[PDB]
């Protein structure tokens, strides 16, 4: 008997482990709604997803819905201030974002739990009466231009758009979703378009209530959340819009049997193989695409990848189904390519078809379905609790595809075995349907076409009928086998009882020469899961460039050889991370703590007795070179950060030094290095989860024992445990290092104001100041001044030292950028004077909320501890300490700080700037006032610069 609600769903199916509460419903205007009650939650969240996206852009205005998406954040009739929304979130511990896919536009935020309504009210207005202010439109068009600019030289985006340009040009699929200055301003002006109209018109046409899903998560009751959503959302007009469909596959007859040869930006070798398939979405309960994805994409013994890897043709493979839109989908198999592989594409593909053929011969396999189903059931039951923001965003999307009651389970639980569908999809994976793309630098200058939006150089060709024929007569090949029963599937899920001496924080339960063990039994999440983290120290992992190279290579070769065996563990929710650090090695094992000791033992055993394959060494090494080389293609702002890291750390080997040194790495040299590296270690570890003190000690000891037994590993001296220091900058000094990015026609800049070592007080000064300037910086440098898409500020922490930093990627030159940040900084101090006492306390409260946000899942908690451990601060209770301290602070305290350490004529200003110039810039010489700046000392040489300066102490361990 409520007119506003069309219906309430029945029980929404949750995992029995899920303590949160749920209600599905549909509003009278047709909006689908999921409500989530979590009385424990620190942040609340909501999301709205409109079932419209760039596929419904007017053909004459590419990127209009992406543009529209940017614009809704910039003011509504009810809250006209350009950044009310942004600011409200900022000063209530929230944040927000949005994205536009071809069929969706998805808007979400989080906020402190007790300001849901405030946030949500402002949020709702996006869908009721956006202003699309005229001067906002003029400015924001640059943000989008910048967004696209950043993607132009990116290889993923180029391939993404190239696929679209090589299908039916008539099809909506072939549209350019991002837009830029040209398509959103320049061209529309020439063509007499009033864009504020087109934005108003499009919003009015498509932002209909019938195409909308809303998820809201908060502490309130389901009844309270119900009234709330009804109140704010039933006034969204139902313009009854038919939901767009795309029955016609964008790849028609003439688009099949085609071969594309593509020149990349980075030096990569890839083979993309694509088949068009119908929309499988409706079969979600049986899911034939997943079954075939699992199989064709398998990596274990007998798998397709396995044979291609053995022939030295490929290193990695992806396969399975790929979204298109309502009405069409793709089935893909993409591999990377060794130098041999490039010359055997025809053979690669024949093996692809031989494997597929094997799947035909053997037919559909219920036990494989059974396994997939059980894994998913286990995954679902024991799923980690999500951060609310991502959770709401995601459910909002799927509300458009699944009955209310199933929204939680529909992407997990499989129900129906369908050999018919498996058969039917399989029948499409045939040589007469194939599209083939080869990406390689060897097509330089051998190409005759250009994709218009990105400038992608490529050539197109009919695959010869004779070749199709060869692929069509693909024999069974004896090296291909279905995978066998997965022995890694966990079966024991008991939660060990909480020991009498479990502690709130990790305890140091072992402190010896060889190893230092931190342990905590999970007292929070109760899932049959564990995290085992190991930091291995050796001075030989980074003693020089050559040694870095070897530490890396060793670890890549190990992973590569372990791959077949570990893949099974991964499907079973048991995975591992293994990489070289500037201190030695890092190992993390994560997942169900049933079969974990097994995988761990296999790993240590392998590293300690490693036997290197000659051919695998050559391939991996070659890849690593290209990898180091390809750095030159990273974004200008990534470059900026890279250089700052190199400038400020005591020891740091450059990519140039690494690639230069990489020629000296021979098979002999590596074999000698491993036992050398392994012969003396210290291990510091975090064991955290569903395990007991006994189990932990045994796990740690088993690791140690395996190393002794096989590598004769003995301890390291306490004095050898060398942590690197941060370079210490001189009062009133200012240095600039400048370099050029040769791929990107944007510039990047990082500005670092070093303050002092970390410590309760210095941390909180920096953190509070960052909180206050956080939103205004974004708002000034981007929204108002439109300096770029990437605009960032906040604390920088490294080697126990800290400071404030700004990162901007922009079309304007770095000296210009410097100027405007400096201007901004004056604004901020002026603003901190003008701001009320409350405004100030609000900011304290926001920081507090952020810092005190409880981890929602095991990994998140481990991460916090691991931060304390690797930084050797071991300040496990730091959050209450630092928040306790924060509340003490006043306007005076922060003004003092800014005056002392940050202001342009600060007594203790310590400033480094990294300038990364655009491809085309050559030299490096109404809006608020920018102060006159000192003569910068231009850093000529990094070694010299470092030798000429003090180094900071290392932080005293808590």
């Amino acid at each position: 008997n409520n007119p506003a609600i069309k219906r309430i769903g029945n029980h929404i199916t949750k995992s029995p482990e899920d303590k949160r509460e749920y209600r599905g419903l549909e509003l009278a205007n047709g909006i689908k709604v999921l409500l989530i009650s979590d009385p424990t939650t620190d942040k609340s969240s909501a999301a709205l997803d409109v079932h419209i996206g760039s596929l419904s852009d007017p053909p004459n205005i590419a990127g209009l819905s992406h543009f529209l998406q940017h614009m809704l954040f910039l003011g509504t009739k009810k809250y006209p201030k350009e950044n009310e929304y942004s600011q409200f979130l900022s000063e209530h511990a929230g944040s927000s974002n949005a994205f536009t896919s071809g069929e969706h536009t998805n808007y979400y935020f989080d906020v402190s739990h007790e300001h849901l309504e405030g946030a949500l009210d402002r949020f709702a207005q996006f869908f009721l009466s956006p202003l699309f202010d005229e001067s906002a439109k003029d400015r924001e068009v640059n943000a989008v231009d910048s967004e696209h600019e950043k993607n132009v030289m990116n290889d993923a985006w180029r391939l993404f758009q190239l696929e679209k340009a090589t299908g039916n040009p008539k099809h909506p699929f072939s549209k350019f979703g991002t837009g830029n200055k040209y398509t959103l301003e320049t061209r529309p002006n020439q063509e007499g378009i009033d864009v504020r109209q087109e934005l108003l018109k499009f919003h009015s046409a498509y932002y209909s209530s019938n195409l909308m899903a809303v998820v809201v998560l908060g502490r309130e009751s389901l009844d309270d959340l119900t009234n709330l959503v009804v109140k704010l959302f039933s006034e969204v007009e139902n313009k009854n819009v038919p939901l767009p469909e795309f029955p016609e596959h964008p790849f028609q007859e003439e688009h099949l049997k085609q071969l594309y040869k593509i020149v990349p930006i980075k030096d990569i070798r890839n083979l993309y193989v694509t088949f068009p398939i119908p929309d499988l979405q409706k079969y979600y309960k049986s899911n034939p695409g997943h079954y075939l994805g699992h199989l064709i994409g398998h990596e274990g013994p007998g798998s397709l990848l396995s044979e291609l890897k053995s022939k030295g043709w490929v290193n990695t493979l992806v396969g399975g189904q790929k979204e298109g839109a309502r009405g069409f989908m793709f089935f893909i198999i993409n591999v990377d390519l060794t130098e041999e592989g490039l010359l055997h594409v025809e053979d690669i593909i024949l093996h692809m078809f031989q494997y597929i053929q094997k799947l035909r011969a053997e037919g559909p396999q219920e036990w494989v379905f059974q396994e997939l189903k059980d894994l998913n059931a286990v995954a679902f039951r024991f799923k980690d609790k999500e951060r609310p923001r991502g959770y709401t965003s995601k459910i909002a999307g799927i509300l458009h595809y699944y009955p209310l009651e199933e929204v939680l389970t529909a992407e997990y639980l499989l129900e129906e075995f369908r050999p018919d569908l498996i058969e039917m999809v399989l029948d499409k994976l045939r040589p007469e349907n194939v599209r083939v793309a080869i990406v390689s630098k060897s097509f330089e200058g051998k190409t005759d076409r250009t994709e218009e939006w990105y400038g992608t150089q490529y050539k197109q060709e009919a695959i010869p009928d004779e070749v199709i024929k060869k692929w069509q007569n693909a024999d069974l090949n004896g090296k291909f086998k279905l995978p066998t029963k997965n022995e890694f599937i966990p079966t024991n899920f008991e939660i060990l009882p909480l020991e009498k001496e479990a502690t709130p924080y990790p305890a140091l339960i072992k402190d010896t020469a060889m190893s230092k063990l931190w342990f905590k039994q999970d007292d929070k999440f109760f899932l049959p899961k564990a995290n085992l983290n190991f930091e291995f120290f050796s001075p030989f992992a980074y003693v020089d460039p050559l040694h870095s190279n070897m530490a890396y290579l060793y670890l890549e070769l190990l992973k590569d050889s372990l791959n077949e065996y570990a893949y099974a563990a991964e499907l079973a929710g048991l995975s591992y991370d293994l990489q070289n650090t500037i201190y030695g090695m890092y190992l993390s094992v994560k997942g169900y703590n049933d079969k974990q000791p097994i995988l761990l033992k296999k790993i240590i055993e392998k590293m300690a007795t490693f036997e290197i394959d000659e051919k695998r060494f050559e391939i991996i090494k070659e890849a690593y070179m290209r990898s180091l080389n390809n750095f030159r293609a990273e974004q200008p702002h990534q470059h900026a950060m890279y250089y700052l890291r190199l400038l400020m750390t005591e020891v740091a080997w450059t990519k140039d030094e690494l690639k230069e040194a990489l020629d000296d790495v021979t098979l002999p040299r590596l074999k000698a290095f491993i036992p050398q590296l392994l012969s003396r270690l210290h291990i510091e570890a975090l064991l955290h989860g569903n395990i007991t003190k006994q189990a932990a000690l045994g796990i740690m000891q088993m690791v140690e024992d395996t190393l002794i037994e096989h590598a004769h590993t003995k301890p390291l001296l306490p004095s050898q445990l060398v942590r690197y220091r941060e370079v210490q900058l001189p009062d009133r000094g200012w240095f600039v290092y400048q370099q050029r990015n040769e791929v990107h026609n944007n510039s990047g800049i990082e500005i670092y104001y070093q303050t002092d070592m970390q410590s309760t007080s210095e941390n909180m000064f920096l953190e509070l100041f960052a909180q206050i300037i956080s939103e205004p910086a974004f708002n000034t440098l981007r929204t108002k001044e439109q300096l770029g898409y990437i605009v960032f500020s906040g604390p920088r922490r490294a080697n126990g030292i800290q400071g404030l930093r700004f990162i901007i990627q922009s079309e304007k030159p770095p000296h210009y950028l410097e100027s405007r940040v400096e201007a901004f900084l004056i604004t901020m101090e002026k603003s901190i004077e003008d701001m009320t006492e409350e405004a100030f306390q609000k900011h304290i409260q926001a920081l507090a909320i952020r810092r005190l946000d409880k981890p929602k899942k095991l990994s998140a908690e481990s991460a916090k501890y691991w931060g304390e451990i690797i930084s050797q601060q071991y300040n496990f209770d730091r959050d209450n300490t630092e928040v306790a301290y924060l509340k003490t602070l006043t306007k005076e305290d922060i003004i003092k700080f800014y005056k002392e350490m940050l202001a342009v004529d600060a007594p203790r200003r310590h400033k480094v700037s990294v300038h990364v110039l655009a491809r085309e810039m050559d030299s490096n010489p109404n809006l608020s006032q920018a102060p006159a700046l000192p003569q910068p000392e231009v850093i000529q040489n990094m070694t010299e610069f470092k030798r000429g300066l003090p180094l900071f102490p290392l932080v005293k361990p808590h």
Binding site: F73, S96, N97, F99, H104, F160, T178, G297, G319, K322
Partner: peptide
């Protein structure tokens, strides 16, 4: 074993 524009 298995795109979109951010704000």
């Amino acid at each position: 074993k298995c795109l979109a524009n951010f704000l």
